[PDB]
Each structure stands twice: as structure tokens, then as C-alpha cells.
Design an enzyme around this catalytic site. Sequence first.
Site, PDB file in Angstrom:
ATOM      1  N   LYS A  36      40.370  36.482  43.836  1.00  0.00           N
ATOM      2  CA  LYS A  36      39.367  35.446  44.019  1.00  0.00           C
ATOM      3  C   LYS A  36      39.764  34.497  45.153  1.00  0.00           C
ATOM      4  CE  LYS A  36      35.982  33.945  40.580  1.00  0.00           C
ATOM      5  NZ  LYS A  36      35.829  33.903  39.099  1.00  0.00           N
ATOM      6  N   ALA A  87      38.649  44.733  36.808  1.00  0.00           N
ATOM      7  CA  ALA A  87      37.837  45.435  35.828  1.00  0.00           C
ATOM      8  C   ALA A  87      36.977  46.453  36.551  1.00  0.00           C
ATOM      9  CB  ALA A  87      36.969  44.459  35.060  1.00  0.00           C
ATOM     10  N   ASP A 130      31.959  30.767  29.346  1.00  0.00           N
ATOM     11  CA  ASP A 130      30.677  31.225  29.846  1.00  0.00           C
ATOM     12  C   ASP A 130      30.572  32.727  29.530  1.00  0.00           C
ATOM     13  OD1 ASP A 130      28.813  29.563  31.880  1.00  0.00           O
ATOM     14  OD2 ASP A 130      28.578  31.702  32.326  1.00  0.00           O
ATOM     15  N   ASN A 135      28.948  37.038  33.621  1.00  0.00           N
ATOM     16  CA  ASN A 135      30.355  36.633  33.585  1.00  0.00           C
ATOM     17  C   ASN A 135      31.230  37.580  32.773  1.00  0.00           C
ATOM     18  OD1 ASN A 135      28.615  34.168  34.091  1.00  0.00           O
ATOM     19  ND2 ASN A 135      30.639  33.257  34.452  1.00  0.00           N
TER      20      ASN A 135
HETATM   21  O1  LIG Z   1      29.854  45.503  41.624  1.00  0.00           O
HETATM   22  C1  LIG Z   1      30.694  46.254  41.060  1.00  0.00           C
HETATM   23  O2  LIG Z   1      30.494  47.494  41.008  1.00  0.00           O
HETATM   24  C2  LIG Z   1      31.932  45.682  40.453  1.00  0.00           C
HETATM   25  C3  LIG Z   1      32.032  44.326  40.149  1.00  0.00           C
HETATM   26  C4  LIG Z   1      33.199  43.820  39.588  1.00  0.00           C
HETATM   27  C5  LIG Z   1      34.264  44.674  39.335  1.00  0.00           C
HETATM   28  N1  LIG Z   1      35.488  44.227  38.739  1.00  0.00           N
HETATM   29  C6  LIG Z   1      35.995  42.890  38.756  1.00  0.00           C
HETATM   30  N2  LIG Z   1      37.246  42.704  38.312  1.00  0.00           N
HETATM   31  C7  LIG Z   1      37.791  41.478  38.298  1.00  0.00           C
HETATM   32  C8  LIG Z   1      37.020  40.409  38.748  1.00  0.00           C
HETATM   33  C9  LIG Z   1      35.719  40.626  39.198  1.00  0.00           C
HETATM   34  N3  LIG Z   1      34.922  39.537  39.668  1.00  0.00           N
HETATM   35  C10 LIG Z   1      33.499  39.658  39.743  1.00  0.00           C
HETATM   36  C11 LIG Z   1      32.915  40.312  40.814  1.00  0.00           C
HETATM   37  C12 LIG Z   1      31.537  40.426  40.887  1.00  0.00           C
HETATM   38  C13 LIG Z   1      30.743  39.883  39.888  1.00  0.00           C
HETATM   39  C14 LIG Z   1      31.329  39.228  38.815  1.00  0.00           C
HETATM   40  C15 LIG Z   1      32.708  39.118  38.744  1.00  0.00           C
HETATM   41  F1  LIG Z   1      33.276  38.492  37.719  1.00  0.00           F
HETATM   42  N4  LIG Z   1      35.235  41.880  39.190  1.00  0.00           N
HETATM   43  C16 LIG Z   1      34.152  46.022  39.632  1.00  0.00           C
HETATM   44  C17 LIG Z   1      32.994  46.529  40.192  1.00  0.00           C
END
Ligand SMILES: O=C(O)c1ccc(Nc2nccc(Nc3ccccc3F)n2)cc1
Length: 263
Positions: A36, A87, A130, A135
Site C-alpha cells: 500500500k 490476497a 469496515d 473491503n
Molecule cells: O483486482 C484483482 O483481481 C485483485 C484485487 C486485490 C487482490 N489482492 C489484494 N491483496 C492485498 C491487498 C489488496 N488491496 C486491495 C486492492 C484492490 C481492491 C481492494 C483491496 F483491498 N488486494 C488480488 C486481485
Amino acid sequence: QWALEDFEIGRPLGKGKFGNVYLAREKQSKFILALKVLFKAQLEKAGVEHQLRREVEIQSHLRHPNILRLYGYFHDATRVYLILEYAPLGTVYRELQKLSKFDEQRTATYITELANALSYCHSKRVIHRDIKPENLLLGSAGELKIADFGWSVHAPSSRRDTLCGTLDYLPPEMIEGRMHDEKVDLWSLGVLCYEFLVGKPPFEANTYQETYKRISRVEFTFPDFVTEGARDLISRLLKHNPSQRPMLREVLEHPWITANSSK
Ligand SMILES: O=C(O)c1ccc(Nc2nccc(Nc3ccccc3F)n2)cc1
């Protein structure tokens, strides 16, 4: 202590108002995580520094399978960086747009997962997470992780509700310009559940004031297909009076939960 070059940077996973989350991997171990990035110039404007500063402090201490782990934090000049668990499966939001609704087994499982997270959080003295789908993220296989933290990020999609996806999840006590106790969270749970089964939240409306009307007056109706144990859980969760809302463990105990919950 880390720094930006300890990391290879992939695509942005989502783009927020204060910055972006990028797919990343520590260069040595080649281990993938989520970075982030917070521009810090919107951070003053928005008047948020010290909060965030102790937020990394708090969330640094949160260990749960259903909570996204914050590995570390660092900063340079223009940017703060949160080193986060990755994730792979993305948002429950896009999943929900995919299927248009979940079923009772998926739903019950997500709800116990969440209940565990919130119960844990409370025991750690942390309230008001949230939990709206945007989220919530999906881990390795199915598992569900509360993201929270950095103010909201999105992967490009839908477009429809941008935000104004806002107060659907806000409790009457919060919207109404009052304080809140831990029970705030159990309102969200109610809402979440509804959405999972319905595909839309109970208070959704084409104007803000009308959404409000429905929330604060707790006016919501179930489509035919919703089962009544579902109804009982939801109705029990959505109550104008916080005090009339269940305790988390009572939620885990609920007959319908136990029935369809894979967990
Ligand atoms: O778009 C996709 O395929 C996709 C979006 C998220 C992702 N994994 C992830 N891991 C850790 C934090 C994080 N932040 C985040 C990013 C975007 C939206 C919300 C979030 F919270 N997102 C994997 C794939």
C-alpha cells in the site's frame, strides 16, 4: 527496516484516493505481498497523520486468519508504505458481481469467518471494522480476510455504485451523529448477510436521504427465496437499538449459521 528497492513492483491491484496498492515481491526471497502506497499530500489535506501512525501500531498487532496481516511499514518523503499480506482471489465484491448472489453455505461460512475476526478484534479492543464487500478480500483457497486500513481502494470494475455505496453499511447510531459501541459491527454483519443472499443491500435506494430514511427507520423487506433462519439472523442483527443486537458468539451459535456454515 525496509525500503522501496527491497521490492519488485507489479501491477496496481487497486487505486485509492490517497494512493495505490501494488502487487509486489521482496527482491531476495521473491515472496509476493501487497504494497500500500500513500501519497501523504492528500494525507494532510484530509488531516490524517497521527491516526494512521497509531493505526499501523494497532494493526501491526492483529493476528488472525480472517484479518489481512500488516507485515511492516516504512516511508520516504512523499509516501508511506504498508507491507501487507497478498490476497490472490481479490474482492468479495467482484465475486458477488460475478455470481450476483451467494448461497447459504457460502454466506454462513463468510459470516462465521467475519464473526471470528470481529470477536478477535474486540478482544484486542478494536471496533468498527469496515466489512462492506469492497473491503473484504479472498485468500489462498476460499478464506475471507478483512482489509480495512487504508482508505478505500478499488480494482477497476462495475461503475454504477462508485461510492454512495456508503451508508448502506452505516448503522443508524453512526449516521445519526452519535457515538457508537462495539455493537456497530453487528449491524454491518446484518447488512452483509442480506447482500450475500440478495445481491443488493437492504437499504439501497436511488437517493441518499431515502437510503437514510430506510436505515434509521429500519425499513427492509426480504425477497421470497430468503429462508427464515436467514431472516431471523438478519432481523436479529438489524435493530435500531444496539442493545437488542446479538453478541458475536451468539451469532456463531445461531441455528441457521450452524446449519449451513462450512466452518
Ligand atoms: O483486482 C484483482 O483481481 C485483485 C484485487 C486485490 C487482490 N489482492 C489484494 N491483496 C492485498 C491487498 C489488496 N488491496 C486491495 C486492492 C484492490 C481492491 C481492494 C483491496 F483491498 N488486494 C488480488 C486481485
